[PDB]
Amino acid sequence: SRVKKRKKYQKAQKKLKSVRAVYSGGQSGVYEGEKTGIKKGLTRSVKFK
Amino acid sequence: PRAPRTYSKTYSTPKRPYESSRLDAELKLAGEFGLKNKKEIYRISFQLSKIRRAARDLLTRDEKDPKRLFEGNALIRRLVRVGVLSEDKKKLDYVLALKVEDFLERRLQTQVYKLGLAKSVHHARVLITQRHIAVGKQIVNIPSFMVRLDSEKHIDFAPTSPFGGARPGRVARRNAARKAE
Amino acid sequence: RLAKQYLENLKSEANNFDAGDLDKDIIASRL
Amino acid sequence: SPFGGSSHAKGIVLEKLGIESKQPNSAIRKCVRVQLIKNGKKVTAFVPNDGCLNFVDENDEVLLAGFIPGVRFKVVKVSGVSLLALWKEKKEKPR
Amino acid sequence: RDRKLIVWSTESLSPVKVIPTKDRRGEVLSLAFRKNSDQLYASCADFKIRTYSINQFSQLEILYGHHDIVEDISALAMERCVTVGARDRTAMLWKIPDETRLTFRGGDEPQKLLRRWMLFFCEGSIDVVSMVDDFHFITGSDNGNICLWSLAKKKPIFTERIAHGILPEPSFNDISGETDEELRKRQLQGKKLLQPFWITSLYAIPYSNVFISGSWSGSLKVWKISDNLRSFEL
Amino acid sequence: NPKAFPLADAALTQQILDVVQQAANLRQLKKGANEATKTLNRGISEFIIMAADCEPIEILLHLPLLCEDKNVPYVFVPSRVALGRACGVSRPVIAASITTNDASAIKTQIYAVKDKIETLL
Amino acid sequence: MNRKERKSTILETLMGDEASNKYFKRKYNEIQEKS
Amino acid sequence: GAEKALFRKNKGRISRYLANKCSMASRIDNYSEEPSNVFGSVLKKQVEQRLEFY
Amino acid sequence: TRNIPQVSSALFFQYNQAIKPPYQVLIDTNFINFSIQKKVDIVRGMMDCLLAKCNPLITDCVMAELEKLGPKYRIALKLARDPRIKRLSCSHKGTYADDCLVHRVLQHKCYIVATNDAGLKQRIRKIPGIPLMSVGGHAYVIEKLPDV
Amino acid sequence: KSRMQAMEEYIRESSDQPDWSASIGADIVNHGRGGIKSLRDTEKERRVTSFEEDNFTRLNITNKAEKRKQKQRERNARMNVIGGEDFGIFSSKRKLEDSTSRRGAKKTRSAWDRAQRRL
Amino acid sequence: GARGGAKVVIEPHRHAGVYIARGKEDLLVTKNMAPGESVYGEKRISVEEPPTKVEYRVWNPFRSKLAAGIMGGLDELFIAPGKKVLYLGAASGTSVSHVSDVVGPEGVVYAVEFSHRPGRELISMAKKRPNIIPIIEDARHPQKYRMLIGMVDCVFADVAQPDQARIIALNSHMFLKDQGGVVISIKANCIDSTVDAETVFAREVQKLREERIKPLEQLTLEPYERDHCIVVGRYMRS
RNA sequence: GGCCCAUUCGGGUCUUGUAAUUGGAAUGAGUACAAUGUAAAUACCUUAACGAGGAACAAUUGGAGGGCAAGUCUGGUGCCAG
């Protein structure tokens, strides 16, 4: 049972990296830019209503 | 015959095992702390709930009750000695502020991973159950061991362990003999 | 105050010669 | 209660009614008429499957449990042996 | 620090046995022979005390309960050795046969000491220890404090602060490279930089009323304990 | 006023030196002004401890620039020789750095001293 | 990179990368074969 | 200064040794309101002494 | 410009790892009323139900709504004004407290909701990582709180 | 019967005399399967060793008496003791006040009796 | 990635005064008021335009939390060309030079700092930028440097103190416009480490409501920073 | 290519997949020489040698979905549906 839950948990972490950004040690070395690209009009801001 | 005996359960099933939040909580907890099944969390939750039930009883009592100062300061001393309750927060409302992951952090598995003796919680567990971890002079093989501060200090590899200075394991000497032969 | 008040109570709840000491002494002379 | 307070019931297998039915694994294939040993009231029961209909034969003891409408009962053992156990070839039916 | 305990013949200094500590972190730091006995006690940096019998050329037992490297060990005719663990700041006695432990801790804080007065330096570590008696012992800390202990009381019965004095203040010509002297003087910060001498050595003659302390101040100080064993003087 | 500011008092120096030895045993200690400098450059440090009695004190004021620019709390201790003894190293030490590790066994007591350092500043 | 690798366009540097060329070579062959 | 050889196996050891000292004396100049040459002089003789050892 | 709100960093899938003791609860108007019906006093009802120190919090809309109820519900208004009940300011035009609360719990994942209104419980249930408090039977009940 | 555990806990801090602690590894019951002995277990055990040494032979445990002294003493453990510190006394209900209360005949009963105690 | 010889593809951002450099990598980029030099060792683009050589400076989201907010996708920013900006907590020109690049020569950036030791670099950076004015003073006491500040369209707060809401408040009443901009960077560890990250942010949004800021949006700065968000508001004195 | 949300259309996110190959270590159940233990003996404790890649030294239970034939049946508005 232990290894199954281990594989499930590392599986579960990944789906959270997909849904949302997470901190992964921050910048490591020289800044190489946005790897996935910058999108002009997509705002991920949370608007106070 | 002679008098029978009292024994008690260390855990209790939750009210509703089936909230998705609940299941995701055991998933996070077993993954982070390498727990075998849900019985360990049921045990820890039961024990913590008992402590909190006592603590709220004392918060109910008026300050300077003999019962209150007695029972609560005893609780604080014990929770400090197990290492869960820090020195600077010796008061019952902070006893009311604990969370189970502190108790899981006090599990010997967590220190074996944390101190650097093991590269993972599961590696810590296999090392412990395999008698490679000694608390001072004594070999311990239970991951659920609750480590004290003074016991936290003295975690090491056992003298009899191949990693602590004993002879190489069966595999090493077997391969060495085959290489020589 | 209450801690002491417990202490006198135990003292109350709890020519001068001890039978056991006399038994230990012969054991020591035996030693 | 279906069994008058009991959880299970004995019966004697009288006839496999749908044995002639054409469509394989049919619900009508699936029904067997069983006479309760308690009171002589003839009733019908469900089996696990057309393979498990094949273990059951007439005049053998069968254990019944609550489950084509009109049929409320399920056969769980035959001659003191579990049908599921026979189906997994984990046991042999005693004659 | 070679993680070995080599026994030498007194007459010729020839090696007759070598006893490894069998620990990577087992550097020997203090050795104390039981008085008028063949028992040897070895305090190591592995946070353990190892017990040997020299006539036996064998290791006997390992003792545990220090919370930091064990710098000094002292023993008398009895098997009640005393040890100090440096930064753990705990003076400590053993019974080898029972294996049980005494824990002694100083517990002084400059805030109260200044108040009851109304320079005191917090103790950093206990580096030296010597047994004046089977029931009494003394220790020296890195705040210049030498403390008298008894088995009856966990806390010190008597303490003598800044025994060896305060270290010389750093020179103002080296404190900073600024030309103006007044600029350099501010870097001295008055007297908040000043620190005390450490008690590098502390030895008490067995079952006597005098003991000697040592440091790099340049003088050996001899102290005398009171008849009642409640205080001492220089 | 002094370049040596803030300077921890006798008590606070003790708990800080408790951090350095225990961090040293756990391989979470980079000691010295030079290797203190990189840890700031990589942003991997909780805080940098320095000695106020250094001769000259000048040789460590490049570090606070990096710390305060990087919002890293810092403290000075009166003695370098005492600091070096805490590093587990046979020589005086003028600067030291505790590195960022939420997976460390001593997280709590570091963050304990963290809060007192921030109050001091 | 060296001055020799610095070029006028983004494009022609992509050619100087041998790893990019082999990656492009292999897939075109697969795409033509299925086509 | 490794592109124009400002500080220039044993030769490299002096360069790194001098570089560490140069990184030092830069500090004493920058963070002192009126820097002096007293520490620079004793810093250079230390470089000098190292020179004859190697 | 198109806007896609982030999912809160305090939420692990559907488990909220931020709400920890002491808790903060938003009180709806019905909850004070139903609390009085069951003779369940406000603060202990969370203490015994949740076994943690609880910081009750009421909005201006809820304070406004309790006031407009009328003389029939005086004790409900008073009880909202107990000192241990803190107040939450609002910067929006409407006094409709239901829309005010859903925004806050949508907005921020550190609150428990205390309500029994039917329209509200379904809406908040859809919001992930939000515990729900309600009064039923003889004492309060907490549905979506892993720590219990 | 009068003794209740935590009053001695205060005494130990307020005694100002050391408490004779034992070694860290010496206190595991059995390889971790049984937690650290509670403080009580270390006194009742030493009563046996102190009681064994003089008599010069061991004490065997009767098959019957074994059935109320071993399990429950270590089932209270897994139910109460966590890391070798007892938590059962906390849940249990006892009249703590009576044990400390000056119930002995030498108690304040009239104004003079308490006036004597000031003197 | 962005290696010296390669070429990049620079275009405007949604927000005025901000640009994006496309290519194999996407870089948040803005122009240089002082071409030919970098303030904190940041990397710079050169574009030949009719031919004059215009230069641009890269924004690192990890170093600058404002740049992290852009990557997070802040909906509306009051910092823009031709707007006065009053930036608090000016450790150095790591972000002030970037905030300057947005406002342009027409605007100015009012940089406020407390400690002297960073101020020397802030003053030196201010020389290269004729619009940046360093006001090295305690932001807890705006009255000390009311002498120095003409009015401001937006106030940005980089100050990491427990009482930052009070610093932002006192500055906002004195200097901010009605309907003016307010942008604040929050580190829950600095304010209250005892309670979770989130609840601190709830409390911080509260103060802005009592001293008359209507707050507009918050943005957590993951993956660039932990335990952080950028709350943006409008100062409604009415 | 993997994953997440969404009745609807679609939208959101990035180090991933192996049903691929390969290396050296650790040790438990077992196979067990001894002593100890004891009226003797069993058991307990301690302890030589051997003991893993399908680590075949081969734990289960329950549920949800598939898909395949020169295969079979039934009803149809062909190549469909059950």
PDB file of C-alpha atoms in Angstrom, chain K residues 88 138-143 157 159 161-174 184 191 203-204 206-208 210-211:
ATOM      1  CA  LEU K  88       8.057  53.528  -1.156  1.00  0.00           C
ATOM      2  CA  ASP K 138      11.191  57.294   7.098  1.00  0.00           C
ATOM      3  CA  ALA K 139       7.903  56.674   5.300  1.00  0.00           C
ATOM      4  CA  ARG K 140       6.245  56.377   8.727  1.00  0.00           C
ATOM      5  CA  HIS K 141       6.557  60.196   8.977  1.00  0.00           C
ATOM      6  CA  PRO K 142       5.503  61.720   5.635  1.00  0.00           C
ATOM      7  CA  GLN K 143       5.561  65.217   7.144  1.00  0.00           C
ATOM      8  CA  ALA K 157       4.466  50.367  -1.597  1.00  0.00           C
ATOM      9  CA  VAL K 159       7.821  48.499   2.283  1.00  0.00           C
ATOM     10  CA  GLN K 161       6.995  46.192   7.804  1.00  0.00           C
ATOM     11  CA  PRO K 162       4.141  45.035  10.064  1.00  0.00           C
ATOM     12  CA  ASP K 163       2.754  48.607  10.147  1.00  0.00           C
ATOM     13  CA  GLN K 164       2.933  49.135   6.378  1.00  0.00           C
ATOM     14  CA  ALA K 165      -0.826  49.748   6.157  1.00  0.00           C
ATOM     15  CA  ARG K 166      -0.288  52.813   8.350  1.00  0.00           C
ATOM     16  CA  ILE K 167       2.639  54.031   6.234  1.00  0.00           C
ATOM     17  CA  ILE K 168       0.559  53.609   3.078  1.00  0.00           C
ATOM     18  CA  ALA K 169      -2.381  55.347   4.755  1.00  0.00           C
ATOM     19  CA  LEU K 170      -0.544  58.461   5.933  1.00  0.00           C
ATOM     20  CA  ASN K 171       1.173  58.925   2.568  1.00  0.00           C
ATOM     21  CA  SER K 172      -2.091  58.324   0.701  1.00  0.00           C
ATOM     22  CA  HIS K 173      -4.041  60.996   2.601  1.00  0.00           C
ATOM     23  CA  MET K 174      -1.318  63.621   2.131  1.00  0.00           C
ATOM     24  CA  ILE K 184       0.977  47.472  -2.319  1.00  0.00           C
ATOM     25  CA  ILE K 191       3.302  41.125   9.189  1.00  0.00           C
ATOM     26  CA  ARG K 203      -6.642  41.466   7.272  1.00  0.00           C
ATOM     27  CA  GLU K 204      -4.505  43.675   5.013  1.00  0.00           C
ATOM     28  CA  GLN K 206      -9.419  45.388   5.624  1.00  0.00           C
ATOM     29  CA  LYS K 207      -7.286  48.363   6.697  1.00  0.00           C
ATOM     30  CA  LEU K 208      -7.338  49.842   3.196  1.00  0.00           C
ATOM     31  CA  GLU K 210     -11.173  51.955   6.806  1.00  0.00           C
ATOM     32  CA  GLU K 211      -8.730  54.660   5.623  1.00  0.00           C
TER      33      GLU K 211
END
